Amino acid sequence: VQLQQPGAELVKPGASVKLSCKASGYTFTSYWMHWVKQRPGRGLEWIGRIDPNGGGTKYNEKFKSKATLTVDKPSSTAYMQLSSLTSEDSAVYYCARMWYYGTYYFDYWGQGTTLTVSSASIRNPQLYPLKPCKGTMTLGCLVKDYFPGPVTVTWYSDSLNMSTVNFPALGSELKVTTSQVTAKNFTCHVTHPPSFNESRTILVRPVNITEPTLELLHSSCDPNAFHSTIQLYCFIYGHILNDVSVSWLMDDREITDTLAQTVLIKEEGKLASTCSKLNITEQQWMSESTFTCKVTSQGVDYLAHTRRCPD
Amino acid sequence: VQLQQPGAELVKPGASVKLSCKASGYTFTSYWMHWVKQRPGRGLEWIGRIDPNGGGTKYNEKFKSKATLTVDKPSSTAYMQLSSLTSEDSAVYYCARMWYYGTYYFDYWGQGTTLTVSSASIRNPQLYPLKPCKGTMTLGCLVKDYFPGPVTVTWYSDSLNMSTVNFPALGSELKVTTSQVTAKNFTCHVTHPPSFNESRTILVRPVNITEPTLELLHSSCDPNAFHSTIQLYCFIYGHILNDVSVSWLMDDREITDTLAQTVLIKEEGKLASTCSKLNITEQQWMSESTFTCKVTSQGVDYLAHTRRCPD
Amino acid sequence: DVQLQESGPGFVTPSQSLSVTCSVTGYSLTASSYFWNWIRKFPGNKLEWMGYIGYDGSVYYNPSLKSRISITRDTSKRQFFLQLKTVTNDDTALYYCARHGYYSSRVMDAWGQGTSVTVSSAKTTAPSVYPLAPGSGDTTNSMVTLGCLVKGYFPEPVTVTWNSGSLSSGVHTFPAVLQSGLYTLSSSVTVPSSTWPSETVTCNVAHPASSTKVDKKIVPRG
Amino acid sequence: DVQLQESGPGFVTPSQSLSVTCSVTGYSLTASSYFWNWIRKFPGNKLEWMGYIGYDGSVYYNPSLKSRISITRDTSKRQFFLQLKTVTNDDTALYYCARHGYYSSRVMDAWGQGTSVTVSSAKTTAPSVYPLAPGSGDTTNSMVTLGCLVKGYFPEPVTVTWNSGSLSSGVHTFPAVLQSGLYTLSSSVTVPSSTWPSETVTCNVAHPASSTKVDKKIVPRG
Amino acid sequence: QAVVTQESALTTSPGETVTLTCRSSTGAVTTSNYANWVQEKPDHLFTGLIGGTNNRAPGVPARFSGSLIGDKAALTITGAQTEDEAIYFCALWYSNHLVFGGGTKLTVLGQPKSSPSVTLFPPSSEELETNKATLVCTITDFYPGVVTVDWKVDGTPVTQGMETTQPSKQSNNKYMASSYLTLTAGAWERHNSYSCQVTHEGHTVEKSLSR
Amino acid sequence: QAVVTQESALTTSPGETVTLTCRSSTGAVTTSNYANWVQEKPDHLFTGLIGGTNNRAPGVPARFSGSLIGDKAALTITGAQTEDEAIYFCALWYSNHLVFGGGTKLTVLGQPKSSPSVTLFPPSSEELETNKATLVCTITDFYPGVVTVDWKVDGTPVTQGMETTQPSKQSNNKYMASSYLTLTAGAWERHNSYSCQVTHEGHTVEKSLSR
Amino acid sequence: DVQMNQSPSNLAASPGETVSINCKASKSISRYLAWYQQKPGKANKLLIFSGSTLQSGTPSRFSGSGSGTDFTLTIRNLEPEDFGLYFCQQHNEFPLTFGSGTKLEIKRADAAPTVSIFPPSSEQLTSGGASVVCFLNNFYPKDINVKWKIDGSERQNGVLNSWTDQDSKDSTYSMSSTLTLTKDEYERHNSYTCEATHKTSTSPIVKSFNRNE
Amino acid sequence: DVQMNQSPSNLAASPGETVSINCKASKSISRYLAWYQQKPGKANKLLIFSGSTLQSGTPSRFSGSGSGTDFTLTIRNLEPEDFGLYFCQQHNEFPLTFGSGTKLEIKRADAAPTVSIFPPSSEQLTSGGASVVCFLNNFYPKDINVKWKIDGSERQNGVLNSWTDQDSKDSTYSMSSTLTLTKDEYERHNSYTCEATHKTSTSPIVKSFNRNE
Numbered sequence A, B: 001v002q003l004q005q006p007g008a009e010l011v012k013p014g015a016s017v018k019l020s021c022k023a024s025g026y027t028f029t030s031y032w033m034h035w036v037k038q039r040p041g042r043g044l045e046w047i048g049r050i051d052p053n054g055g056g057t058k059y060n061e062k063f064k065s066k067a068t069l070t071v072d073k074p075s076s077t078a079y080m081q082l083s084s085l086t087s088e089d090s091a092v093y094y095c096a097r098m099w100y101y102g103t104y105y106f107d108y109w110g111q112g113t114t115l116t117v118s119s120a121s122i123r124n125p126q127l128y129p130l131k132p133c134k135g136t137m138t139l140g141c142l143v144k145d146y147f148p149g150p151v152t153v154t155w156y157s158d159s160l161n162m163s164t165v166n167f168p169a170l171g172s173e174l175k176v177t178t179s180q181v182t183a184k185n186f187t188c189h190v191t192h193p194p195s196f197n198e199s200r201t202i203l204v205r206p207v208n209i210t211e212p213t214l215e216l217l218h219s220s221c222d223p224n225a226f227h228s229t230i231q232l233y234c235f236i237y238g239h240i241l242n243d244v245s246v247s248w249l250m251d252d253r254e255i256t257d258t259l260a261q262t263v264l265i266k267e268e269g270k271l272a273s274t275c276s277k278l279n280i281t282e283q284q285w286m287s288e289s290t291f292t293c294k295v296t297s298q299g300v301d302y303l304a305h306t307r308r309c310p311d
Numbered sequence C, D: 001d002v003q004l005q006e007s008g009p010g011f012v013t014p015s016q017s018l019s020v021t022c023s024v025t026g027y028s029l030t031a032s033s034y035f036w037n038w039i040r041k042f043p044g045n046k047l048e049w050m051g052y053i054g055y056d057g058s059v060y061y062n063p064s065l066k067s068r069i070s071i072t073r074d075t076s077k078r079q080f081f082l083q084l085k086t087v088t089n090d091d092t093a094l095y096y097c098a099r100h101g102y103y104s105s106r107v108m109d110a111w112g113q114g115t116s117v118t119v120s121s122a123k124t125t126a127p128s129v130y131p132l133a134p135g136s137g138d139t140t141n142s143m144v145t146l147g148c149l150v151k152g153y154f155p156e157p158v159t160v161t162w163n164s165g166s167l168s169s170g171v172h173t174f175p176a177v178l179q180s181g182l183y184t185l186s187s188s189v190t191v192p193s194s195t196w197p198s199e200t201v202t203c204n205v206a207h208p209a210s211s212t213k214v215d216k217k218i219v220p221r222g
Numbered sequence E, F: 001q002a003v004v005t006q007e008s009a010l011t012t013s014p015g016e017t018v019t020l021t022c023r024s025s026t027g028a029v030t031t032s033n034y035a036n037w038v039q040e041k042p043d044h045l046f047t048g049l050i051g052g053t054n055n056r057a058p059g060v061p062a063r064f065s066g067s068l069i070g071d072k073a074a075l076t077i078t079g080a081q082t083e084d085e086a087i088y089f090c091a092l093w094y095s096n097h098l099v100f101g102g103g104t105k106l107t108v109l110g111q112p113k114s115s116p117s118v119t120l121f122p123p124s125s126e127e128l129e130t131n132k133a134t135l136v137c138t139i140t141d142f143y144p145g146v147v148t149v150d151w152k153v154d155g156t157p158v159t160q161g162m163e164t165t166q167p168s169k170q171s172n173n174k175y176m177a178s179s180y181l182t183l184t185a186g187a188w189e190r191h192n193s194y195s196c197q198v199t200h201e202g203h204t205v206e207k208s209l210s211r
Numbered sequence G, H: 001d002v003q004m005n006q007s008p009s010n011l012a013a014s015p016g017e018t019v020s021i022n023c024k025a026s027k028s029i030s031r032y033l034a035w036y037q038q039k040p041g042k043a044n045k046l047l048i049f050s051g052s053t054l055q056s057g058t059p060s061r062f063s064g065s066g067s068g069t070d071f072t073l074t075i076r077n078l079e080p081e082d083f084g085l086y087f088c089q090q091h092n093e094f095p096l097t098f099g100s101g102t103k104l105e106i107k108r109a110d111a112a113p114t115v116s117i118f119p120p121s122s123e124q125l126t127s128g129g130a131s132v133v134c135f136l137n138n139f140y141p142k143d144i145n146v147k148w149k150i151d152g153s154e155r156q157n158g159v160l161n162s163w164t165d166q167d168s169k170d171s172t173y174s175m176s177s178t179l180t181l182t183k184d185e186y187e188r189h190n191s192y193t194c195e196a197t198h199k200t201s202t203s204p205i206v207k208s209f210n211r212n213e
């Protein structure tokens, strides 16, 4: 169920406006359509009720000389036209469903249309994209100078888990919208009546880094052999297919005399897994010196450290 | 170059035999063909010389009444026919090449044909396959009872590096041939003149076992962490695709409380490689107890033992 | 490159829970073999290693702080958090987050700036600003040191300027002294003793914890 | 299952090279984690572990035998070989090959029967066979023990039967005694003293090292 | 005319029960008034709760009940949830029209204090092409809904172009706001360090940028 | 008639030089005799070495040379190899025929002693279907070429059906032989253990089987 | 825990000179001792670890030596960037423990403090309290003493002192001293004096005021 | 090397009885000591390792205990298959070393030896030597003594003894004794005697011959 109303309308004093309320997701001719007025900082005022099944219109005595109710079955749309408009009429007008058969109750309301009645000049919005400034994805749009009052904002994205926040306006008529993202591109779309002053602005800052997993294993003494060859195995799983660089260190000083054997284990599309083998002596392992395989990929230094278990 | 002569011939006393010597790999009409007689335990006797280019035959005075030389250019074959045959003529007759132009010298000889002149009865060979009897591949054939004297043997195989040995005969007329093999099937073929008493006998005992490689690795203490999880990795490379069973032991007693994680690493046609992971406590590893992964495949027990490096 | 930034409450009441966040930039909290520590310095320059959480999720704490501290992490936000339960005045300290694990032997290879945490049973207080003017007459065309006493406020910090920053040079702002549960600070500016009688010399004191902004003009005494 | 079989020369001259082969059945010499050892027993029942070659090709020797021994292998034949250089009389022993590595702590899980090696500066000698008959008359229908003395032969073994195996029961063949460089052995058979005077009692002595086969009929003395 | 009166604001703790009343100037509310109860939440979201005098609308939890108590209509919430904090409007039918009340602001206690999330955006290149600049400091998810904002570039800004909005309640019953520092493009090129401080319950959350 | 005479046997060490002579009963060998030298190796393999009096055949190593020394023809091997151990025949041409000598058996020393490889084959099922049986004991690769064979089933076989061949030289200048134990099928079913012993230079190599 | 004892707590030097800091360990830490450096307004930075191993970015003029329980960091040819805070950390065992630290300040010519005394304001005396202030600006060395005198009587109660860091421009120090009295006590007396004893003057620099208008 | 001392060297028992063998170590071998068994005509077979761990096929009647430098193998409810040779091996360190071994023979009823003396043959006296032989067949226990007497004079030179293994059918022993003389020495005397002292007779069993035909 959805009752679609325009975001905002603008007229000049003495003119007439035709507000609409489009139905969706329910039987159009089975519910009453009420119209309710709300001025900022005030309560609710009932205007009129219209029966979409027939022509049953009923008005409050206060609004009889100003309001006219209409129903469009082919378009499934309710209408309220206001005439003799003054600044006293600038308000949000909601349409609401009411159930008639059996019990009497309300349920679904519209979002309301903000009607402004003014002869003042119009200032169209200025859209500036808000640069996140590295240190965090948080995008946003600043709607600087605009005027008769109302401004609406929507967002486009290439999917993703995205949240949006629309902030209240300043007394100097400035507005801000923001978007938090949980790798795509983004843009914001702003509408500013009169008419459709639809502006749009785009922004994006992408990323792309793959983090591999390191397993530093060790070949220990076979208890059946007098001498065992101690060898360290640096397994790098899931790195970028063509970007990996392995070096070895002992006590945090790079090993250059002994050569390591670095071979490819597996390829999975654009990813790969490799193993680097390095031999050390039994004395070096027994000395409780540390050993490190430093893997460099995409400018990132992953490391793995090992040492015989002391005590 | 090859001078092909029959293995052996048999005639009755007073009859005539036609021995042949087929040429191969050289100009047939450019070499002299000599015939030389050798009786067992004696030296060589020259019989005749024939010129394949013309009809130049020359005989030793001793063999003029018995030997006749013939040359067949279309068949590239020399012939010597012996008449008035007695037991004095039972011998090996070789054909030999001699170079005429420039210098006079011998080079290539035939294998010789063993001519036996006898009226005795004929006993055809009995082929029995020699069972290697497990404990070693060594196949063979026993040619039990046979007679006028000569017996020849050849072998068939489905390729492979194969060696063969043909043994001398007993005074009771028994023979043996053997074959050493470096997984196929084998058979032996025996010829026993008169005519072609070609018999054959087959034998085979196949095998099929794949030996995997074991690597028992160990995750040691990270010197940057206060507590490290000690884990043993039993890598089994190149086992049979659907036959591998891994169990774990500590101090040669099977581990049943702790569960191991055994997963597949890679598949290569009918082979595969897996890894079994087992967690142990730091105390268990420091206690210098032994740890074993016992891998069973195709009824064979491969094992890997590990232990912290002592002292 | 890696950047660590601390974020705390500034002040906390005793018996309450202390929570400090460390935001990490450049590296992942799950990158292989890195360990993220909380350490703290007490007023007497004593450093105390509190604990760490590892790249693998493992944690280890100083035994003197066990049962009180808890280190957690959010890897999507790339933040890790220290929680200290039932704080006392002996928990007042400058809290750093650090990273070790680049080198092999338990050495901090990255440090944050640190965030100050005062554990005090005191509430937010706006300061009283008093003028500091000489108690005697000035010789003509001499130099005069005027000042402002910003007394009885909590918590830190407080910002003191002179003539809205016009008097930049000749300014001395002293570190606040904590007496009872309140801070006392003194600021001074040196100007020509001919500028003071003909122009305005005012200190602007801003205490954002109470949203206080006051101006104090230094008027000669009589 | 695994079977180990030794194969040696039987006897070797001092200062020469000793070579012993171990044939293996059932298992590969390269199967993971198995070790193949040479061990030997001296006449006084003392066992000495000599050394091993590993599944990986590595070797390790008893330090008392280092620079003298060498252990090699042929993996296609599934054999492994011990070579001992410059043998002396103190190298006379029963040589076994063994397999350890099934269990974790250096314990022989398979043994061969063993092959005897006599290091002696002596050559092949056929034996002299003398009869052993009583030096007195026999009571009628008594039992008589006759025998054969197989003296002065080298090397072992020698095979002694009685009437080509017809006299199976009542036979005692004693272990040979090595004096000088020669072996002496005695065999005996017990028969009715009524069988001896009417039938033939002959010992058959076979020494294959000299291809000797002799028959000695036990004739009564006078 | 006929007017409808409700309480200005009520306060309940989670798990408790609360009653909101609706009085008519005509004297006594009856079943002929069809006492309707509607719920308003942030972003102008109205939801009909109860019709008749007790006829619950489909999709409304059972903890909302309606009745007539004394001469007034009454909406009782039995076992209040934190999601029930909202503005509740009464509506009575008189012959040919419907009259709403002023609404009752129902606050639900027990909600924990929440520190604000702050994001500082520098001016875009397009705005710097003009002769001005606007640094944007957005603030979300703070409770209670009172907050102050200061700026710091030259040590202690006094006036500059510091402007803030009033706190507005979010759908999660937390609050949001935004602050702005308007300066000139020349002043932007002149200074380097910029910082927004957001003070809430005596604690300051600060963001900063440069370049 | 005219006969040709050579030495019966000569012996040389590897690396040394050796001369084999060829004398004619007619008096003196000349270039008109075309003194040919041929080489015989095991398995009846004859290879022509030298023609004329010194005309080396293609494919013959240069260490083989021919000459006329005194009244005889002569083949000189300069730097003898172990592969040269063979039977060397001389051949002289007389008018209308060619006369061979008796041949010289050239032995090359320095060859190490080699123990025999022994293989014991049990009787096949097809032979056991008859009323007899033949155990086969093959022997190869032993040097020197003298060997004795014994059998063991019932302790000490005396006669039975023990038969052996004479040692025959292999192409590698080692020797081969075979032994046979013929028994009855009933005797085969009666006994279980069977063994062949092969004694060479006083050392015994033994093989055995059962079932 | 391993207790690290660092010495000395304060060093003064000029650029180009050589200094040394020492750390003792309550128990043997093998070679695992690290030296860290902190510049004013900067995060802590690791210089040396494992006793003598330098980071790639640590200048060669820094070196470390020692073992067991005695370790020393030596800094040769001091550059202006080297003045700051230094501290040692044993990294042989958990928990990781640290030393007290050493402040290396830069030397400069001796400077006499500008002394200035301020009486309490009327705004403060309205509430019932009084604060007498004494400033000593731009002096070196840091060693300085302050004596409060009321009618010639020394006063030690109610005094708070606050020293500044070494100035990043002229290498001087500044000190504030506040004496707190009640209004009733402040109005009992006439002459208020602060005396500043510093290396630059044999007699103390005396600043006073009379409570009488 | 580790020296293993095994005791006792000989045990005699009947089926159903319990026996124990001990091995001392010159140095501590922890728990790593193994017991092996050898039956007559069979290869060595590992019974126990690591002091007390049995192979899967080792019967439960075999057990092992001990540590450090003292280890004991106990065999309860002896079966006829358990009689043979036993030896210990330390497997704590290389080189692997072994003990002397223990022979466990089966008991049987005491049996007197059949004694038989043989003079030298004419074939041997042709060459110039002489060998006098004395047999002692089918006796138990193995303890037995032989004295050679020539004309009543004891002879100890030129004597060789040879004992058989315990018979696999009747559990008895047999012994041969050969006295070697020269022909010249043999023909100097008349009476040749061997005396056999055994448990089954108070007086020694005496067998003699006269050199006179």
Ligand SMILES: *[C@@H]1O[C@H](CO)[C@@H](O[C@@H]2O[C@H](CO)[C@@H](O)[C@H](O)[C@H]2NC(C)=O)[C@H](O)[C@H]1NC(C)=O
Residues within 6 Å of the ligand: A229, A231, A259, A260, A261, A277, A278, A279, D056, D057
């Ligand atoms: C580490 O050392 C081992 C030896 O302990 C190396 O493995 C040997 O490699 C050679 C070839 O270079 C082979 O001939 C040997 O058979 C190998 N030994 C075994 C037991 O198989 C290994 O290559 C070395 N690896 C590195 C990275 O240094």
Ligand SMILES: *[C@@H]1O[C@H](CO)[C@@H](O[C@@H]2O[C@H](CO)[C@@H](O)[C@H](O)[C@H]2NC(C)=O)[C@H](O)[C@H]1NC(C)=O
Residues within 6 Å of the ligand: B229, B231, B259, B260, B261, B277, B278, B279, C056, C057
């Ligand atoms: C061995 O122990 C490790 C823990 O030290 C296990 O890894 C953990 O597995 C659980 C799931 O069971 C995960 O939630 C943890 O995140 C893992 N730990 C880490 C550090 O990643 C591992 O599964 C165990 N393996 C075996 C075979 O026991």
Ligand SMILES: CCCCCCCCO[C@@H]1O[C@H](CO)[C@@H](O)[C@H](O)[C@H]1O
Residues within 6 Å of the ligand: A211, C030, C055, C056, C057, C058, C075
């Ligand atoms: C590209 C590889 C990224 C790996 C991110 C792994 C983040 C979580 O990893 C693991 O998940 C477990 C969930 O049960 C947690 O319990 C563990 O603490 C954590 O280590």
Ligand SMILES: CCCCCCCCO[C@@H]1O[C@H](CO)[C@@H](O)[C@H](O)[C@H]1O
Residues within 6 Å of the ligand: B211, D030, D055, D056, D057, D058, D075
């Ligand atoms: C199916 C797997 C069979 C593996 C058989 C490997 C046999 C040889 O393996 C290795 O070959 C090297 C050659 O240089 C030798 O030096 C090494 O000693 C040996 O271990």
